[PDB]
Design a protein around this nucleic acid. Structure first.
Lengths: 189, 98, 47, 170, 184, 126
RNA sequence: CGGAACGGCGUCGGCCGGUCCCGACA
RNA sequence: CUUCGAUGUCGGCUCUUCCUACCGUCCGCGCGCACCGGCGCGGAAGCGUCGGAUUGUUCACCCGUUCAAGGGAUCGUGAGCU
RNA sequence: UCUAAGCGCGCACCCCGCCUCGCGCCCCGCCCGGCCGCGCGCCCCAGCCCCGUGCCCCGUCGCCGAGCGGCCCCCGCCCGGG
């Protein structure tokens, strides 16, 4: 479950594409807060240029260009997978992309890829645009809803924080051999 | 089978050794978990490995011989060549010498 | 229009140099027209 | 890349019985490339091609850098228009190391490969007479500055396996 | 170790505190908060000097320290006294009727070049336009924030524009006479 | 930037190269991107490392190799970093490196006991 | 980031000069 | 170079897309821009770019009108026609 | 000083709305059934407030429940007239 706040839309899609093909299955959340490196006007025109690519004879056989950001992250991970072959079709299916943390994956333990994070990658002043804002200007009309929900979720998780320290402080308080062997016996783990 | 209480160290069989125009099915590239450098792949060199054919239920045993990358994924040959449905499945290197 | 209010006008209208390639207004003490990719040609005009 | 002192002389001929032994200080990775630079210098300067000449000795001179020395190197290069002359000052522990830095920078900005660059002279300019501003900052001894790349611990992420619970603070 | 720095002596009337890059200037007139997240900064308080200190300026990083220090100076001036931009309506045969519509928060301009269209310019928050008693045909814009006062000043000039014509002969509309950092 | 600048005296953690994990005092600063590192009591020969190969410790040592070693003897900073979290973790990390395939198995089984022990106690203490 | 003669106060690196405690009518 | 054991070949009609090196309209900007009007730019392809006399004619030229840019798609388009 | 950091205004263009289609999905009704998993602080990186860890065992001995999700789950025609 790799959260995508601050992660590069290309570099996360390299770590996650190897995992899917290795056969791990992952869920990506908070997708709108991922960053597509470069100035927004250029990033917006690179997507509003891609959305001009369509089969002249029938735009229905044409490349499908997706506006909601969960799809924008996954179409990228589709290039880095042999989508047409069966071993690829199983892995594209093994990716669940959620724009914003839905109640479906909220309780899941969350990990982040530090290496592909724009903070640790782009130099300060490179100029970065979040796929969520590109999404709104390419044609996403569901932006406010996913922010209202995310606020309400971060609010119930703020009440939970107060509750969570209490349960885990009692656990720690009752520390009454693995602690003195697994990381402490000429092991140092 | 002869595998039940083997403690085991996890692994994933990523693919057959290959070039962009030829595939050697004789060897298998196995990604052990915990081995991140070529010199690190000396603690897992020549150990027994096992992949369970999901459909057959049998433990197809194998042996690792040489590291494939500076990264430490290690090449391995199984007693019988892996089918290919098991590409991206899970092999368990056995801690127990047995 | 009173002379003081014809002076305010000229300051924010007829007192700047327009490049001979960009044709875009640039400040009176000018080195390179901002919107003509540099360029060291400028003129200005008077009513 | 390494300091070799090379000595050469024209073959002994009946007209002039012993030619005066020449000496040169050539910075090069290996003896074969140092000697080739020597016969690139001697053919151009003293009208003597190795085919009619003998290299007497190529002593490999190394030094112990137990301190840092401000070094100034005058070189000449070849570009897409024509040749030029550059005084580039490099601070390093050893003169051979200084030439390595001057060779990496000259190919890094001026795009000049080893063969084109010719080092006219290399000297240990003292702290008082440093001429280049970047070297001048470390001429004084206060030298306090934050690490330029603290984000460079992004190379720790590869071994952590890019699967960290939180994004690390710097 | 090369850096770019400028130190601003604090005028006692101000009590600015900078946490992160956010600056907050407290003074007799009011509070002025500005966000300095955009540019790398080592802004520091202590004593009475706020010093920018941008580190290792490669080449465009040497500019921001003076600009950042400037905005901290402009912020100090507004709270101590405040910024007044006086704009003068200039016209020939057709006259201009400008009104303070709301409680100083709005201006409406009528009869410019006999335009039936009546432009109404809403001020940015805290810039209160007022008809000027001292000169006439003049609107004084008083606010602590210089940038906000000036953008409103642009809005009134921008709204009143001759459609086509030579701007030089047919010059009208409002152009700022002079910006004043004293007496609001 | 706000704490810990590159100064001579700064004990430095050497991240890359063969000096992984070693700690040494920067003596002369060659350039924005290089420093001479001499650790007289930690096996780091005086050399030039980029600052990328060198994370910086908070402790700065009040300061050849004999002279620096004589200064470290007086300076209590080297011991304090070992007491510091980064140091105590660094000692623990040294034990992890001295662990082979059999010695990885014992730990893996031992930590399963913890992964269950933590989940047994957690539900009772609710 | 096919391409030119050409421009550029984009940003680094040189070169040939000078003026500069006499401070670059005071 | 490809096609001669065959790629229907000129224009018109009918119809569809495309391109900007944009004529009018959209947004600015410059004038030897008072106004009307002209003229030169930069962004701009959305819409408009007609009705006719002669000629097989593409073109040409004239007469009108809400005044009328240029081209491409096997010289788009013959098991669509003429 | 228009721009470097910001910041305002802003085009018959563009993107969305309206509008046409819409795979699937949601709710109710009929029936209300089976199966599967086990896991959350946030924010920021020029304060980075203690950094530079942790997990590292999805069968390896884990699998009760509770509680949160999922996942399957279900519905006639002919025949007259429009």
């Amino acid at each position: 479950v790799i959260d995508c706040k601050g992660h590069i839309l290309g570099r996360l899609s390299a770590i996650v594409a190897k995992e899917l093909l290795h056969g791990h299955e992952v869920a990506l959340v908070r997708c709108e807060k991922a960053i597509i490196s470069g100035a927004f006007r250029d990033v917006k025109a690179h997507y509003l240029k891609k959305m001009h690519k369509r089969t002249n004879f029938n735009h229905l056989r044409g490349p499908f260009h997706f506006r909601a950001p969960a799809e924008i992250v996954r179409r990228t991970i589709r290039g880095m997978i042999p989508y047409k072959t069966v071993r690829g079709s199983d892995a594209m299916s093994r990716l669940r992309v959620y724009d914003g943390i839905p109640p479906c994956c909220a309780r899941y333990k969350r990990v982040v890829c530090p290496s592909a994070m724009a903070y640790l990658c782009l130099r300060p002043e490179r100029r970065r645009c979040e796929v969520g804002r590109v999404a709104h200007e390419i044609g996403w009309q569901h932006a406010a809803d996913v922010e209202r929900y995310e606020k309400r979720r971060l609010e119930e998780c703020d009440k939970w924080y107060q509750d969570k320290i209490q349960i885990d402080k009692k656990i720690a308080e009752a520390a009454e051999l693995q602690r003195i062997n697994a990381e402490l016996a000429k092991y140092g783990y | 089978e002869e595998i039940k209480g083997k403690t085991f160290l996890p692994a994933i069989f990523v693919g057959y050794q290959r070039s962009r125009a030829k595939q050697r099915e004789n060897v298998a590239l196995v990604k052990v978990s915990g081995i991140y450098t070529r010199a690190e792949t000396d603690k897992v060199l020549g150990r027994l490995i096992a992949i369970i054919h999901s459909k057959s239920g049998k433990p197809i045993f194998g042996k690792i011989c040489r590291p494939h990358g500076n990264s430490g994924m290690v090449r391995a040959r199984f007693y019988t060549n892996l089918p290919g449905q098991l590409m991206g499945h899970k092999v368990r290197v056995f801690y127990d010498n047995i | 229009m009173e002379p003081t209010l014809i002076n305010l006008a000229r300051e924010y209208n007829q007192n700047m140099m327009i490049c001979r390639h960009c044709y875009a207004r640039n400040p009176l003490r000018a080195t390179n027209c901002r919107r003509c990719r540099g360029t060291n040609l400028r003129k200005k005009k008077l009513s | 890349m390494q300091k070799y002192i090379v000595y050469g002389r024209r073959l002994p001929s009946e007209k002039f019985p012993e030619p005066e032994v020449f000496r040169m200080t050539i910075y090069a990775p290996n003896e074969i490339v140092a000697k080739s630079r020597f016969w690139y210098h001697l053919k151009s300067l003293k009208k003597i091609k190795r085919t009619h000449g003998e290299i007497l000795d190529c002593q490999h001179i190394e030094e112990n850098g137990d301190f840092v020395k401000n070094f100034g190197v005058l070189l000449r290069y070849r570009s897409r228009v024509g040749q030029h002359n550059m005084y580039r000052e490099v601070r390093e522990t050893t003169s051979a190391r200084a030439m390595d830095k001057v060779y990496s920078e000259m190919a890094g900005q001026c795009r000049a490969r080893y063969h084109d660059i010719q080092i006219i002279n290399v000297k240990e300019v003292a702290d008082e007479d440093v001429r280049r501003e970047k070297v001048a900052m470390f001429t004084q001894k206060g030298v306090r500055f934050p690490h330029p790349c603290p984000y460079v611990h992004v190379k720790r992420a590869a071994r952590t396996a890019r699967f960290q619970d939180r994004a690390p603070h710097v | 170790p090369l850096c770019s720095s400028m130190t601003i002596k604090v005028p006692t009337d101000v009590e600015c505190t900078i946490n992160k890059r956010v600056v907050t200037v407290k003074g007799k007139k009011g509070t002025l908060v500005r966000d300095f997240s955009h540019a790398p900064l080592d802004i520091t308080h202590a004593n009475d000097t706020i010093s920018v200190a941008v580190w290792f300026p490669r080449g465009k990083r040497n500019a921001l320290p003076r600009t950042i220090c400037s905005h901290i100076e402009n912020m100090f001036k507004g709270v101590t006294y405040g910024f007044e931009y006086k704009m003068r309506l200039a016209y020939a045969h057709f006259p201009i009727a400008a009104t303070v519509v709301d409680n100083n928060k709005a201006i409406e301009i009528r009869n410019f070049m006999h335009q039936i269209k009546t432009r109404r310019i809403e001020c940015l928050p805290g810039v209160t336009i007022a008809m000027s008693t001292n000169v006439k045909d003049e609107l004084i814009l008083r606010g602590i924030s210089i940038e906000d006062v000036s953008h409103t000043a642009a809005r009134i000039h921008e709204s009143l524009k001759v459609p086509n014509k030579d701007l030089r002969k047919f010059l009208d509309g409002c152009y700022v006479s002079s910006r004043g950092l004293q007496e609001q | 930037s706000y704490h810990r600048f590159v100064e001579a005296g700064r004990l430095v953690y050497l991240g890359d190269g063969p000096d992984k994990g070693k700690l040494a005092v920067i003596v002369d600063i060659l350039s924005t991107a290089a420093v001479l590192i001499d650790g007289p009591t930690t096996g780091v020969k005086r050399q030039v490392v980029s600052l990328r190969w060198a994370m910086l410790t908070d402790q700065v040592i009040n300061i050849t190799t004999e002279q620096l070693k004589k200064e470290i003897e007086a300076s209590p900073a080297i011991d304090t970093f070992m007491n510091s979290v980064w140091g105590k973790k660094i000692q623990q990390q040294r034990l992890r490196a001295k662990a082979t395939f059999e010695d990885m198995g014992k730990i893996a089984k031992l930590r399963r006991e913890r992964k269950m022990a933590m989940k047994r106690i957690a539900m009772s203490i609710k």
